Design a protein around this ligand. Structure first.
Ligand SMILES: Nc1ncnc2c1ncn2[C@@H]1O[C@H](COP(=O)(O)OP(=O)(O)OP(=O)(O)O)[C@@H](O)[C@H]1O
Ligand SMILES: Nc1ncnc2c1ncn2[C@@H]1O[C@H](COP(=O)(O)OP(=O)(O)OP(=O)(O)O)[C@@H](O)[C@H]1O
Ligand SMILES: [Mg+2]
Ligand SMILES: [Mg+2]
Ligand SMILES: [Mg+2]
Ligand SMILES: [Mg+2]
Lengths: 321, 326
């Protein structure tokens, strides 16, 4: 049995998602007989009552934002149940490196690269993984019409949970979308919109897990509400895909994981067009672990229960560090 | 005037180079009237006496041995406007220290966490070079089989650590039998090892200061295959010519490519990009350095001087670019 500190919370716009991931991981690791310290990185160690309260606090319909978030802003292994910001972009990983601490997920370079959607997409192309055309703001509206056209997606280069993201259907929607994305980070991506199906591939310990599909119905994007509200969307693992397409999504996800030098586990997101082509959006080094999240379902479809998933992640981190 | 803490020394194999860079920066910023604190990151804050002692230490012909290397906000540092990072290699240059400073809310010089980590990873940097339209020699990462090496790289080839500086750990391999000993050597100096095609020809370098290229420099190697630790840091060991005696279109192309590299890796403040110019006139980008040497024999200060920028002014400008970024 291990002594695990589960770090969660943080000060990114994914703080509420992180609280929920942390609460599931804490409960699972305790159920497997480990000693677990619950650490909200915004405040410190929690006692049993505060910790029972956080296990009951479900993600809300909008992310923490504006003034509310501004106000907030012997262990064998640190389980990083953070998402976004310094917890995911390599900053915390470097700090733990410097202190000689073992932790879960990817190292500091890998985490920084995966968080920079632009850089990651250059690396996807270098690894033979197809990805949609993109520009970084500022781009003249002339350059946008010339290279991407509409519809397109505007998104922060380094968010999660669909924070700051808009579909832009015409020139008049473009500036407001860029302004919105710029409230959530310093770089902003404009990316060709890929119509089609929403697919995702988890990786654990350099093996692909069963592909999952998110059934969006009429929605163009998979948004914060549908990601985290129980029952909001049907998510199917293994996805109802032709075997060759599912195999190709798994092959591509492992190529991405290796190209970015990731460790432990990851989750890669794709859009699948009606012509059968997969377009890689991004990869996540600290994917969500909430009760609605995608990676636990991929693991369960592989025959890996949630406590075992958490334990295996811990051991992979110890082995790496 | 600024209050600057110059961080130097460290624990990488480039420690002696960093002591010399830090001594240069300290004296230059003092000439310009700033208040300068000298911090050896391996020990702590230095006094006037040990400044003279430690800082006068000269780079030797060989780097420190493994055994010797294995051997902020506090008091005086209150009110520091910027940390001038006079470190080279290791955690000082690979993004680790930059992330620590980010977490503490401190301003510092050079590039940020991601940019520094990428530029240090020679492999990743070269993938980005190609993505930006910057030519770079073919490479494999160890292990590579005899067939892979023979088919894709050929001999001679270069073996080097993926993340060193100062030509530490690097060998020219002339035949298959030399390959394993070179990989083992490079693996004493980091975790990944690159096998890169050898580019015969001339040795060229381009400094960048805040999104402008500086005059190109050439290092005249004589018969030597590579520019090594001894010849980098012993005064007058090689001639270094700024501006280089190159056809102007070749020098202009080297500057264009260096700026593309600097922008592609999201660097800030300054950098120095190294190229080999092959015998057919084509430039091959080796790497970019986010914390290039600043010693009295170093390349970046000479490129700045050729641009009309004295060393104290260069150091001040770097401080202000770091403060602006942070
Ligand atoms: N180019 C695109 N084409 C179509 N849909 C897109 C595109 N980019 C993003 N989306 C939609 O927006 C959602 C979020 O985008 P993306 O995965 O890039 O960002 P994220 O906020 O980092 O996601 P996560 O919550 O997985 O961290 C996607 O799941 C998809 O529904
Ligand atoms: N592929 C190559 N072909 C020819 N010479 C090479 C090649 N790679 C490296 N060299 C030689 O080795 C030297 C050091 O290589 P490189 O610049 O890649 O490493 P470094 O140790 O990071 O250097 P620096 O001291 O600039 O940090 C070069 O200046 C060059 O003389
Ligand atoms: Mg994401
Ligand atoms: Mg996603
Ligand atoms: Mg170098
Ligand atoms: Mg070099």
């Amino acid at each position: 049995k291990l002594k695990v500190a589960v770090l969660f919370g943080g000060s990114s716009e994914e703080r509420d998602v992180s609280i929920a991931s942390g609460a599931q991981v804490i409960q699972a690791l305790r159920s497997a007989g480990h000693q677990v310290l619950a650490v909200d990185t915004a405040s410190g160690l929690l006692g049993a009552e505060e910790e029972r309260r956080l296990l009951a606090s479900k993600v809300k319909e909008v992310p923490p934002d504006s003034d509310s978030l501004a106000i907030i802003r012997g262990v064998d292994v640190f389980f990083l149940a953070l998402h976004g910001g310094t917890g995911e972009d390599g900053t915390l990983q470097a700090l733990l490196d410097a202190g000689g601490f073992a932790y879960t997920g990817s190292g500091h370079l890998a985490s920084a690269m995966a968080m920079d959607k632009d850089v990651a997409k250059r690396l996807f192309l270098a690894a033979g993984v197809e990805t949609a055309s993109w520009l970084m703001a500022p781009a003249s509206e002339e350059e946008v019409r010339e290279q991407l056209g509409f519809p397109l997606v505007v998104k922060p280069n380094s968010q999660g949970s669909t924070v700051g993201l808009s579909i832009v259907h015409s020139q008049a929607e473009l500036q407001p979308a860029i302004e919105l994305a710029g409230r959530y980070g310093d770089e902003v991506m404009l990316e060709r919109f890929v119509a089609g199906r929403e697919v995702t591939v988890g990786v654990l310990d350099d093996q692909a897990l069963p592909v999952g599909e998110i059934l969006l119905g009429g929605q163009e994007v998979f948004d914060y509400e549908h990601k985290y509200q129980a029952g909001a969307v049907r998510e199917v693992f293994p996805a109802d895909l032709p075997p060759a397409i599912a195999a190709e999504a798994q092959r591509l996800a492992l190529k991405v994981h290796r190209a970015l030098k990731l460790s432990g586990y990851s989750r890669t997101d794709f859009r699948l067009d009606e012509q059968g082509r997969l377009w890689c959006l991004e990869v996540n080094t600290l994917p969500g672990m909430t009760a609605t999240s995608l990676l636990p379902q991929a693991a369960a479809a592989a025959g890996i229960g949630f406590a075992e998933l958490c334990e295996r992640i811990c051991r992979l981190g110890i082995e790496r560090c």
